[PDB]
């Protein structure tokens, strides 16, 4: 009697060492007398359907030599899990296993004052990116600087097309605590870290200043005239976070039509933002008052600020 | 005389080391009483072993066979961090080889490595480079830190207030 000889071969890295998108794992079972031979594979112990692998048992007289190829993609090897081709032969068990021979970024949302002042529904999302996955715990901690017992949040995942997984979470907030500026601390954990990451912010600091909001009109061009564009300015306030909006005839105006600028600070230490919005023909034939409204904290009385500007 | 394998002394958590004092007790008539923190040991041989170290087993260590001449208090450095310079010997006599190396967490891939004479960026190289100073001299003491490329993020390892004994 001779026991079989099991070895494992794979695909190849080229003369620069690059990457085939599918890898071919050839499990060989050579040097054995035939008899009772059934073959399986164990991907992390788990089995899949019988149509991912191929074999050709070569029988040389009293000896035999089984080869057995399995083809997967590259990304399963890039998933870095362990595969175990296994054969049953006369009870005596011989096997071999093979696997392959990171970062963690997170963010945090700051919502719109519309959701605070007008929609009035504060639900804060804590944002984690670059979830290169593991098999262990991802134990998260939404937590509070005041430490009162919390309510419950969201939990979702997505495997991105550049490969990675993700988790974020969204917890509801009260309003008045943020009006008073309560601070909170979403907090994930992981065992593989030498150290972990905390993150926190709240309502901003400093004194308060109201802005100088205005908006004006454009003339026409000799080329075409039925498609004009208006724009909105603001300047010299503190702090900076403002829902800006768009009003005409009790309709929330569509978002992707208007373009806004970025908050830059003025040279006189205030801040200033501008915007833009195209107009077309038939709506001025309808009506003329289109309100670029905004929401600054120091706006009066209900954080209400606009100039109703029109044409002619 | 403690013969430390490996002669590096500052470690992360859960790591292994060879602990061996005097070679003059090579034939070992009396066994070795090791002193974690003063507390008497239980090791039969004259070599102690650590596998998967604990933070709370650290600190002052001595041993002795049975002679009045007890070993020296050796102090141990278990860590859990991101950036670590890594040394063999601090109280170094004159004319001695000096050993200098930096270490990353779970022994990973760090690049763009500057060694620092006490603030002054003394030697950069693109990767790790085990520095040797084969003979000690006068102006060599100081407090020396490290910098590199970690997951594209960038931090700075600790500076170490090196003292030279001058004879």
């Amino acid at each position: 009697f001779t026991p079989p000889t099991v070895k494992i071969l794979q695909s190849s890295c080229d003369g620069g060492g690059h990457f085939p998108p599918t890898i071919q794992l050839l499990c060989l079972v050579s040097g054995y007398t035939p008899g009772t031979i059934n073959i399986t594979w164990l991907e992390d112990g788990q089995v899949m359907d019988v149509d991912l692998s191929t074999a050709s048992t070569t029988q040389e007289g009293e000896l035999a030599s089984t080869q057995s190829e399995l083809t997967l993609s590259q990304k399963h090897w890039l998933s870095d899990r362990t595969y175990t081709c296994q054969v049953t032969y006369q009870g005596h068990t011989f096997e071999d296993s093979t696997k392959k021979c990171r970062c963690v970024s997170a963010y945090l949302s700051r919502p719109s004052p519309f959701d605070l002042f007008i929609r009035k529904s504060p639900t804060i999302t804590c944002l984690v990116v670059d979830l290169a996955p593991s098999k262990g715990t991802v134990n998260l901690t939404w937590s509070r600087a005041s430490g009162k017992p919390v309510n419950h949040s969201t939990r979702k995942e997505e495997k991105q097309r550049n490969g990675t997984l993700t988790v974020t979470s969204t917890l509801p907030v009260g309003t008045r605590d943020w009006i008073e500026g309560e601070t909170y601390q979403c907090r994930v954990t992981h065992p593989h870290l030498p150290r972990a990451l905390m993150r926190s912010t709240t309502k901003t600091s400093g004194p308060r200043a109201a802005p100088e909001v205005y908006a004006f009109a454009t003339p026409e061009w000799p080329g075409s005239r039925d498609k004009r564009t208006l724009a909105c300015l603001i300047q010299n306030f503190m702090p900076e976070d403002i829902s800006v909006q768009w009003l005409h005839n009790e309709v929330q105006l569509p978002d992707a039509r208007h373009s806004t600028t970025q908050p830059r600070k003025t040279k006189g230490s205030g801040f200033f933002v501008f915007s833009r919005l195209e107009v077309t023909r038939a709506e001025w034939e309808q009506k003329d008052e289109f309100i670029c409204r905004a929401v600054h904290e120091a706006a009066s009385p209900s954080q209400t600020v606009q100039r109703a500007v029109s044409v002619n | 005389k403690v013969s430390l394998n490996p002669p590096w002394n500052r470690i992360f958590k859960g790591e292994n080391v060879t602990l061996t004092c005097n070679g003059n007790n090579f034939f070992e008539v009396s066994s070795t009483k090791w002193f974690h923190n003063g507390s008497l040991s239980e090791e039969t041989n004259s070599s102690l072993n650590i596998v998967n170290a604990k933070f709370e087993d650290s600190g002052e260590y001595k041993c002795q066979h049975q002679q009045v001449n007890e070993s020296e208090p050796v102090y141990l450095e278990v860590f859990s961090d991101w950036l670590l310079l890594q040394a063999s010997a601090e109280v170094v006599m004159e004319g001695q080889p000096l050993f200098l190396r930096c270490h990353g967490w779970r022994n990973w891939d760090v690049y763009k490595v500057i060694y620092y004479k006490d603030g002054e960026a003394l030697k950069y190289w693109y990767e790790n480079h085990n520095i040797s100073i084969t003979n000690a001299t006068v102006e060599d003491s100081g407090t020396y830190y490290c910098t590199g490329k970690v997951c594209q993020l960038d931090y700075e390892s600790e500076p170490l207030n090196i003292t030279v004994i001058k004879a």
Partner: antibody, heavy 120, light 112 residues
């Protein structure tokens, strides 16, 4: 925001009794962030004394508790401390502070000005 | 005295401007739980109010420069400043916040 007014430095005989006060300027204290008393012996060490939070949960120092107590008035926004049976070594500088929570551990944004007690 | 006692090192230092200066306080037992060290950093101003320097042994409160750096491990923990400034003369402290009652170091004043 919040501002602090300590009150009550003076000279009282040992083993006597006195009361304290700690005035808050800018927050109804009943709703969060523990309300605390602090000792420091000048020229010497430091002392967290005790800690009471907004729901009324108290904590004291075990070497000291058994002779001193603490009272509260959040409507007057002012909380106090009656002291009893003091020795010579209680001559120190005494502070008042405001707890801030983090993971079962607490901290102060707020430091008092410190008042002087001098007992023989 | 059944709890952890805190010993700072050195006690006081005479210095000059722009210097890269360091201190170290020491504890007895290690309480570094869950990868967290429950230590904080403090400064009294002599004749005036105290001040938190660093909470959670690594994180600065809002309103400081960046010239300052705390570190250490186990019971050995260590604060460093890279550059001295004229505003830097005060008295300075570290403190633990894990197991109550919460203990303190002896204090450190800087000279020139």
């Amino acid at each position: 925001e919040v501002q602090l007014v300590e009150s009550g430095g003076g000279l009282v005989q040992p083993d006597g009794s006195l009361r304290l006060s700690c005035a808050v300027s800018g927050y109804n204290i009943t709703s969060g962030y523990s309300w605390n008393w602090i000792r420091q012996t000048p020229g010497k060490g430091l002392e967290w004394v005790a800690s009471v939070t907004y729901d009324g949960s108290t904590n004291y120092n075990p070497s000291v508790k058994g002779r001193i107590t603490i009272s509260r008035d959040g409507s007057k926004n002012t909380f106090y401390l009656q002291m009893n049976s003091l020795r010579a070594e209680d001559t120190a500088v005494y502070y008042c502070a405001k707890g801030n929570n983090y993971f079962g551990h607490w901290h102060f944004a707020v430091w008092g000005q410190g008042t002087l007690v001098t007992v023989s | 005295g059944s709890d952890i006692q805190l010993t700072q090192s050195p006690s006081s230092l005479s210095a000059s401007v722009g210097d890269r200066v360091t201190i170290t306080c020491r504890a007895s037992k290690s309480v570094d739980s869950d990868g967290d060290s429950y230590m904080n950093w403090y400064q009294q101003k002599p004749g005036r109010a105290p001040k938190l320097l660093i909470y959670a042994a690594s994180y600065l409160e809002s309103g400081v420069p960046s010239r300052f750096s705390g570190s250490g491990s186990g019971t050995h923990f260590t604060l460093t400043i890279s550059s001295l400034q004229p505003e830097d003369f005060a008295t300075y402290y570290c403190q633990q916040s894990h197991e109550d009652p919460y203990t303190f170091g002896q204090g450190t004043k800087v000279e020139i």
